[PDB]
């Protein structure tokens, strides 16, 4: 799935055409196209958990906007396609506007219908059999959680309860015709697990930054790669977690073990679950792994290096402002404003010109 950054070029024509406009891409592997597709959506670093809604059901103009987005594809097409089905448009209807093969269309309609059920049955309705069916089709714990009106963690717990965990298949070039000595794996909900983790070494996991985006480029991947090269050389068993098909990080040669997965709490927690690593590095892949830091810790992940809290201290404007203060360092004068006139007054205090952020 391509990765766009249209929000950084507002004046730009954001319709997809023959001239590339994407700044990156993500890839996912699934035993099924549905599973494959959803895994990519949640690994895109756009805040999707899958087919998150773009329009409101009760919006009277919705069909009109959906229609538009379908006929003239933009970076958001995918989501609109799902909204079309929630809005009552048929597969044939959608095909006609998009020219996307029905073969794919039907599959997305089925994910919609499935979601509607999750929304109707709620959490009570999430029995093992059904939950499994949902996982098998690539639904993220997070997507489910929203439909069920619960916390992502709740779905995750429910999964634990049921012993509903993905297994790992390996990439081999031959559809299992021949054995493999490489540890290039992907998650899926099936029977046999091919992870066969080692009890032998002290493992170090490196978290990738997912698809590239403006501001989150190759520089991070570069770091990731080095982390792996160095520690593996040092004697550790290096585990890389990433889904950018364009990188060196995602080369099986780059590490001892490669988990070609979405860099998400869910997906990461699962690997850890079975890997039981010695430490995890969340500081080298950009914003992506950074945002997971706290959460991971919370869940018991053995996060190495600068602490999630330490990171927050730096990231939190307020938290920061205090260490500075304490340190007796110099910062430009600031102020957090709520209201318009509040700012206009508070501004006289700070003095123009000003840097207004939201």
């Amino acid at each position: 799935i391509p990765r766009f950054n249209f929000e950084k070029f507002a004046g730009a024509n954001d319709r997809l055409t023959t001239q590339m406009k994407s700044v990156g891409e993500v890839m996912a592997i699934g035993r099924t196209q549905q599973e494959s597709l959803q895994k990519a959506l949640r690994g895109l670093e756009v805040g999707a958990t899958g087919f998150d809604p773009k329009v409101s059901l009760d919006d009277p103009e919705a069909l009109t906007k959906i229609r538009r987005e379908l006929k003239d594809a933009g970076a958001d097409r995918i989501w609109y396609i799902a909204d079309a089905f929630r809005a009552g448009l048929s597969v044939d209807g959608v095909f006609n506007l998009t020219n996307i093969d029905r073969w794919f269309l039907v599959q997305i309609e089925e994910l919609v219908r499935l979601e509607e059920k999750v929304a109707e049955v709620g959490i009570t309705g999430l029995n093992a059999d059904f939950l499994r069916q949902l996982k098998r089709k690539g639904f993220a714990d997070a997507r489910l959680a929203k439909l069920a009106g619960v916390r992502e963690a709740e779905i995750r717990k429910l999964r634990d309860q049921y012993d509903l965990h993905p297994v790992y298949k390996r990439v081999d070039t031959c559809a299992a015709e021949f054995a493999t000595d490489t540890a290039y794996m992907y998650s899926t909900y099936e029977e046999e697990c091919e992870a066969n983790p080692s009890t032998d070494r002290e493992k170090i996991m490196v978290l990738g930054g997912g698809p590239n985006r403006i501001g989150q480029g190759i520089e991070f991947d570069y770091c990731c790669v080095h982390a792996s090269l160095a520690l593996r050389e040092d004697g550790y068993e290096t585990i890389m977690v990433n889904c950018n098909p364009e990188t060196v990080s995602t080369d099986y040669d780059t590490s001892d073990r490669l988990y070609f997965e979405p860099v998400t709490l869910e997906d990461v927690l699962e690997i850890v679950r079975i890997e039981k690593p010695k430490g995890v590095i969340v500081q080298y892949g950009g914003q992506t792994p950074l945002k997971l830091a706290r959460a991971l810790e919370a869940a018991g992940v053995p996060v190495i290096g600068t602490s999630p809290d330490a990171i927050d201290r730096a990231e939190d404007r307020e938290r920061f402002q205090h260490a500075v203060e304490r340190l007796k360092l110099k910062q430009p004068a600031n102020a957090t404003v709520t209201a318009i006139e509040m700012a206009v007054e508070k501004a006289k205090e700070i003095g123009y010109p000003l840097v207004v952020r939201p």
Partner: protein, 379 residues
Amino acid sequence: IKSALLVLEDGTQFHGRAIGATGSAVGEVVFNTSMTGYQEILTDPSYSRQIVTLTYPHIGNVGTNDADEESSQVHAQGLVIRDLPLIASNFRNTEDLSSYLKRHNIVAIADIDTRKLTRLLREKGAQNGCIIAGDNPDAALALEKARAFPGLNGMDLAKEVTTAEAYSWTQGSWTLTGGLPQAKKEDELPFHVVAYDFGAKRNILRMLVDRGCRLTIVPAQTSAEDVLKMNPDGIFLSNGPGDPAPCDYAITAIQKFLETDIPVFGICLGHQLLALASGAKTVKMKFGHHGGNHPVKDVEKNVVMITAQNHGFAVDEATLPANLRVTHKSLFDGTLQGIHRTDKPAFSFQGHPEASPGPHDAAPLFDHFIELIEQYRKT
């Protein structure tokens, strides 16, 4: 719940969903790596008494069509797949897969860990299994049926799937443009090839025709005596199911042709027979070769061909008579792939030059045959 279940000899079970007929199915469980061509595989006689597992998850994406049938019926005992798509989406489809199945009254299961299966068969070799599709599939029963299965070793399947009566064939190949062509006129075809029907694939015949061959298909147990009477320009040995070993009549007949100057050529089963008729020995492969991405080298030319394979029994290289010269070998396992008679105008190929689901790489194998013919005619 429209349950389906598959049990292997080893008692290993896969519980999925029924997608074809209601019933039970028992045979040797195999795996095919072919990413496309499921209908052609289904309709391959060679598959008789075999439960076909497909490694590629989505089976059925393009539906089905007459043109894509390699035989008059479905030879596969049963079908095991990972996922049956909601729909078929191809301009050439005339019926969805499930429908086709039920129609051919084929027991089929979907939604099982086919990968788990494949690695099992690869590791522990072929296994006889059973698929039961119904309300309450009896696991115990399935195991039972699976275990009870005779096995394909020493199983002449050729006789079972061969034509009742001989018959002519003058139909050529399919084109995107004119689909399946109208059968040609006898006069129209220069050569006359007699084809022993060991459970022959329609493509082989179509491809022969394409090279100006009027055919005469014949049952498996036809006598060389009877055959020669026909004054054949060439004799052809089709592909077919089971063991070739026990096909005494076939072997005998061939040896007979091996006394004559008539150009002979076999494919797959026809390949093993020729070998047997030459003093070679056949072996039953651990899990065999079923796929369409198989590299095979023309040892003579030192060139690689990607091929379509479907065989569970091979000709032992080490036991070859001196009159037999190696022509092709597999790049995957180096197993025997082609042989040529040093002393006669006879040769064969383990893979399928006609393919049918698969790469057109081995096609020229047919040419050699023609050349031989033309050369025999000159005489």
